[PDB]
Short mmCIF file of C-alpha atoms and ligand atoms in Angstrom, two decimals:
data_model
loop_
_atom_site.label_atom_id
_atom_site.label_comp_id
_atom_site.label_asym_id
_atom_site.label_seq_id
_atom_site.Cartn_x
_atom_site.Cartn_y
_atom_site.Cartn_z
CA UNK V 215 149.19 131.64 96.07
CA UNK V 216 147.14 128.55 96.95
CA UNK V 217 145.02 126.62 94.49
CA UNK V 218 143.99 123.11 93.51
CA UNK V 219 146.84 122.36 91.13
CA UNK V 220 149.71 119.90 91.51
CA UNK V 221 152.08 122.60 92.71
CA UNK V 222 149.76 124.66 94.91
CA UNK V 223 147.00 122.22 95.83
CA UNK V 224 145.61 120.96 99.20
CA UNK V 225 148.85 119.01 99.91
CA UNK V 226 150.85 122.24 99.96
CA UNK V 227 148.47 124.42 101.99
CA UNK V 228 150.14 123.65 105.34
CA UNK V 229 153.24 125.66 104.38
CA UNK V 230 151.36 128.97 104.36
CA UNK V 231 148.54 127.88 106.68
CA UNK V 232 149.92 125.56 109.45
CA UNK V 233 146.36 125.14 110.78
CA UNK V 234 145.85 122.79 107.81
CA UNK V 235 147.20 120.08 110.09
CA UNK V 236 145.00 121.17 113.00
CA UNK V 237 142.69 119.28 115.35
CA UNK V 238 139.32 120.20 113.78
CA UNK V 239 139.82 120.40 110.02
CA UNK V 240 137.14 119.87 107.35
CA UNK V 241 135.89 118.15 105.32
CA UNK V 242 135.59 114.65 106.83
CA UNK V 243 134.09 111.32 105.83
CA UNK V 244 130.73 110.74 107.47
CA UNK V 245 130.52 107.12 108.62
CA UNK V 246 126.77 106.61 109.01
CA UNK V 247 127.24 103.63 111.31
CA UNK V 248 129.37 105.34 113.94
CA UNK V 249 127.52 108.67 113.82
CA UNK V 250 125.70 109.19 117.11
CA UNK V 251 121.95 109.75 116.99
CA UNK V 252 121.35 112.61 119.42
CA UNK V 253 117.68 112.93 120.46
CA UNK V 254 118.32 116.31 122.11
CA UNK V 255 119.14 117.87 118.73
CA UNK V 256 116.34 120.30 117.90
CA UNK V 257 115.10 120.74 114.33
CA UNK V 258 116.76 123.34 112.09
CA UNK V 259 115.03 126.65 111.53
CA UNK V 260 115.79 128.19 108.14
CA UNK V 261 114.25 131.64 107.67
CA UNK V 262 115.22 132.76 104.16
CA UNK V 263 111.96 134.54 103.26
CA UNK V 264 113.49 138.05 103.39
CA UNK V 265 116.82 137.15 101.78
CA UNK V 266 118.44 139.87 99.67
CA UNK V 267 121.07 138.74 97.16
CA UNK V 268 123.40 141.44 95.83
CA UNK V 269 125.98 140.04 93.43
CA UNK V 270 127.82 137.02 92.11
CA UNK V 271 131.61 136.95 91.85
CA UNK V 272 134.30 134.64 90.43
CA UNK V 273 137.12 134.78 93.00
CA UNK V 274 139.63 132.49 91.36
CA UNK V 275 138.67 129.35 93.28
CA UNK V 276 134.85 129.30 93.07
CA UNK V 277 131.97 131.72 92.49
CA UNK V 278 130.35 133.48 95.43
CA UNK V 279 126.73 134.66 95.57
CA UNK V 280 126.74 137.44 98.17
CA UNK V 281 123.87 138.64 100.36
CA UNK V 282 123.07 141.74 102.38
CA UNK V 283 123.81 140.76 106.01
CA UNK V 284 123.32 144.16 107.73
CA UNK V 285 120.09 142.89 109.37
CA UNK V 286 118.49 139.54 110.28
CA UNK V 287 117.09 139.01 106.76
CA UNK V 288 118.09 135.41 106.07
CA UNK V 289 118.93 133.46 109.21
CA UNK V 290 119.61 129.96 110.48
CA UNK V 291 118.96 128.84 114.04
CA UNK V 292 117.90 125.80 116.02
CA UNK V 293 119.54 122.47 115.34
CA UNK V 294 122.85 122.27 117.26
CA UNK V 295 123.13 126.06 117.29
CA UNK V 296 122.86 128.59 120.08
CA UNK V 297 121.86 132.01 118.82
CA UNK V 298 121.07 133.38 115.37
CA UNK V 299 123.39 133.00 112.40
CA UNK V 300 123.13 135.31 109.36
CA UNK V 301 123.55 134.19 105.76
CA UNK V 302 126.45 136.06 104.15
CA UNK V 303 127.10 134.06 100.98
CA UNK V 304 127.09 130.67 99.29
CA UNK V 305 129.39 128.81 96.90
CA UNK V 306 129.86 125.32 95.50
CA UNK V 307 132.71 122.84 95.08
CA UNK V 308 132.49 120.57 92.03
CA UNK V 309 134.44 118.02 90.05
CA UNK V 310 135.67 117.45 86.52
CA UNK V 311 133.45 114.36 86.35
CA UNK V 312 130.14 113.39 87.98
CA UNK V 313 131.83 110.90 90.33
CA UNK V 314 133.67 113.50 92.40
CA UNK V 315 133.19 117.09 93.49
CA UNK V 316 131.80 117.03 97.03
CA UNK V 317 134.10 117.70 99.96
CA UNK V 318 132.28 115.68 102.61
CA UNK V 319 131.68 112.05 101.74
CA UNK V 320 129.06 109.68 103.18
CA UNK V 321 130.48 106.21 103.81
CA UNK V 322 133.21 107.18 101.36
CA UNK V 323 130.67 108.01 98.63
CA UNK V 324 131.45 111.23 96.71
CA UNK V 325 128.76 113.42 95.14
CA UNK V 326 128.95 115.54 91.97
CA UNK V 327 129.13 118.77 93.96
CA UNK V 328 128.49 120.38 97.33
CA UNK V 329 126.78 123.66 98.17
CA UNK V 330 127.95 125.66 101.17
CA UNK V 331 125.67 128.32 102.65
CA UNK V 332 127.90 130.36 105.00
CA UNK V 333 126.45 132.07 108.10
CA UNK V 334 128.05 134.02 110.97
CA UNK V 335 127.01 134.27 114.65
CA UNK V 336 125.27 137.64 115.16
CA UNK V 337 126.52 137.79 118.74
CA UNK V 338 129.86 138.83 117.26
CA UNK V 339 128.73 141.87 115.26
CA UNK V 340 130.39 141.12 111.92
CA UNK V 341 131.93 138.28 109.92
CA UNK V 342 135.49 139.41 110.64
CA UNK V 343 135.08 139.05 114.38
CA UNK V 344 133.04 135.83 114.07
CA UNK V 345 136.11 134.12 112.55
CA UNK V 346 137.99 134.71 115.82
CA UNK V 347 135.55 132.53 117.76
CA UNK V 348 135.17 128.71 118.02
CA UNK V 349 131.42 129.04 117.44
CA UNK V 350 131.63 131.94 115.00
CA UNK V 351 130.31 130.24 111.87
CA UNK V 352 127.62 127.79 110.79
CA UNK V 353 127.82 126.29 107.31
CA UNK V 354 124.92 124.36 105.79
CA UNK V 355 126.28 121.76 103.39
CA UNK V 356 124.04 120.29 100.71
CA UNK V 357 125.06 117.48 98.34
CA UNK V 358 124.26 117.64 94.62
CA UNK V 359 123.71 114.52 92.55
CA UNK V 360 123.19 114.34 88.78
CA UNK V 361 119.63 113.53 87.73
CA UNK V 362 116.69 115.85 87.08
CA UNK V 363 117.19 119.59 86.73
CA UNK V 364 116.77 121.90 89.72
CA UNK V 365 114.56 124.78 88.47
CA UNK V 366 115.68 127.03 91.31
CA UNK V 367 119.31 126.76 90.16
CA UNK V 368 118.89 127.88 86.53
CA UNK V 369 119.14 131.58 87.38
CA UNK V 370 122.65 130.96 88.76
CA UNK V 371 123.56 128.72 85.83
CA UNK V 372 122.55 131.39 83.31
CA UNK V 373 124.66 134.22 84.71
CA UNK V 374 127.91 132.20 84.81
CA UNK V 375 128.90 133.33 81.31
CA UNK V 376 129.31 136.94 82.46
CA UNK V 377 131.70 135.98 85.29
CA UNK V 378 133.82 133.42 83.43
CA UNK V 379 137.21 134.65 84.64
CA UNK V 380 138.78 135.52 87.98
CA UNK V 381 137.80 138.93 89.29
CA UNK V 382 134.59 139.36 87.32
CA UNK V 383 131.33 140.06 89.12
CA UNK V 384 127.75 140.84 88.17
CA UNK V 385 124.69 142.24 89.92
CA UNK V 386 122.59 139.31 91.11
CA UNK V 387 119.52 140.52 92.97
CA UNK V 388 116.24 138.87 93.86
CA UNK V 389 117.65 135.33 93.95
CA UNK V 390 115.79 133.11 96.42
CA UNK V 391 118.07 130.51 98.08
CA UNK V 392 115.03 128.54 99.25
CA UNK V 393 114.99 127.03 95.76
CA UNK V 394 118.19 125.12 96.63
CA UNK V 395 116.91 123.22 99.70
CA UNK V 396 116.05 119.51 99.68
CA UNK V 397 112.67 118.32 100.96
CA UNK V 398 113.98 117.06 104.33
CA UNK V 399 116.07 118.91 106.88
CA UNK V 400 117.57 115.83 108.61
CA UNK V 401 121.28 116.37 109.21
CA UNK V 402 124.64 115.36 110.66
CA UNK V 403 126.64 117.90 112.66
CA UNK V 404 130.23 118.17 113.92
CA UNK V 405 132.78 120.91 114.76
CA UNK V 406 135.12 121.78 111.90
CA UNK V 407 136.72 124.48 109.74
CA UNK V 408 136.51 126.39 106.48
CA UNK V 409 137.68 124.11 103.68
CA UNK V 410 139.73 126.77 101.91
CA UNK V 411 142.55 128.92 103.34
CA UNK V 412 142.74 130.44 105.91
CA UNK V 413 141.07 127.16 107.04
CA UNK V 414 139.85 128.75 110.27
CA UNK V 415 138.46 126.41 112.91
CA UNK V 416 135.25 128.27 113.77
CA UNK V 417 132.69 126.17 111.98
CA UNK V 418 129.72 124.20 113.20
CA UNK V 419 128.95 122.00 110.22
CA UNK V 420 125.39 121.00 109.41
CA UNK V 421 125.37 118.55 106.50
CA UNK V 422 121.95 117.60 105.18
CA UNK V 423 121.28 113.92 104.61
CA UNK V 424 119.13 114.40 101.48
CA UNK V 425 120.96 115.58 98.36
CA UNK V 426 119.29 117.72 95.68
CA UNK V 427 119.50 116.64 92.05
CA UNK V 428 120.66 118.85 89.19
CA UNK V 429 120.85 118.02 85.49
CA UNK V 430 124.00 117.09 83.63
CA UNK V 431 123.55 120.30 81.61
CA UNK V 432 123.44 122.44 84.77
CA UNK V 433 126.59 120.93 86.25
CA UNK V 434 128.34 121.19 82.86
CA UNK V 435 127.98 124.97 83.06
CA UNK V 436 129.98 125.06 86.31
CA UNK V 437 132.91 123.37 84.55
CA UNK V 438 133.14 126.14 81.95
CA UNK V 439 134.30 128.71 84.52
CA UNK V 440 137.98 129.66 84.65
CA UNK V 441 140.53 129.78 87.49
CA UNK V 442 142.67 132.25 85.53
CA UNK V 443 142.01 135.92 84.95
CA UNK V 444 141.20 137.39 81.55
CA UNK V 445 144.12 137.41 79.12
CA UNK V 446 145.75 134.36 80.68
CA UNK V 447 145.98 130.73 79.47
CA UNK V 448 142.69 128.93 80.07
CA UNK V 449 142.62 126.82 83.23
CA UNK V 450 139.13 125.35 83.69
CA UNK V 451 137.66 125.66 87.17
CA UNK V 452 137.06 122.02 88.11
CA UNK V 453 137.98 119.85 91.11
CA UNK V 454 138.02 122.77 93.53
CA UNK V 455 137.49 120.45 96.52
CA UNK V 456 139.65 119.41 99.47
CA UNK V 457 140.02 115.72 100.34
CA UNK V 458 138.69 114.33 103.65
CA UNK V 459 140.73 115.13 106.76
CA UNK V 460 141.27 112.93 109.87
CA UNK V 461 138.38 113.06 112.32
CA UNK V 462 140.76 112.95 115.31
CA UNK V 463 138.94 113.49 118.62
CA UNK V 464 135.52 114.42 117.25
CA UNK V 465 132.11 112.80 117.18
CA UNK V 466 129.60 113.30 114.39
CA UNK V 467 126.02 113.50 115.64
CA UNK V 468 122.88 112.76 113.64
CA UNK V 469 119.48 114.38 114.13
CA UNK V 470 117.81 111.26 112.75
CA UNK V 471 117.76 107.52 113.27
HG1 HG E 720 137.83 130.45 115.07
ZN1 ZN E 721 132.99 125.55 100.67
#
């Protein structure tokens, strides 16, 4: 099926998912000089204090840390959002080298990686129905730059060995996602889509201005994961990011000046 290789990469996705050439595709380049400062944008409210992580899984294109979303345990609200959005999972996109890896770019600048915390609008009952609505999802995007180590990320880094190949999973409880947030919650927001097939256009993107730094050693661990399943030729999981898409008729708003 789809992937990030020469023969099944982002350029080929449109054949199986025509929406790839849609009107509100992600990611996009964030031009800081044309972004519109919107003073009506309220601050973000991140309530992750009762978060309950369950397991981590290598799905062939990234690794997913899944959470229990049967109750308002870890929620996002405020900002450009109407209603409460529940955290269901998070994953990253990274590169083969420190100079690439993020999906969104800021004034064309690429970061080493990008964290996506996926949430769904509780008004819709479950994730499956949320993806049928234009305001069904809210994804918090956080940039990662190489520098000092992020203590709160080591727990994830350490378990990667047990889920090296596609299909493997491991129990991953008591992980606190608050350890992955930057100091400031200033952000840019725009209407977009999931960046991997089915590329559904139900996402309200909230990209934080301030990146978090991780050590070279931490990011190196990501690059040791495999795309392939066990007993198959080794294909390192690197460059699992989609290039910027045309903004078309959309305006990116900023919560800061
Ligand atoms: Hg949708
Ligand atoms: Zn993503």
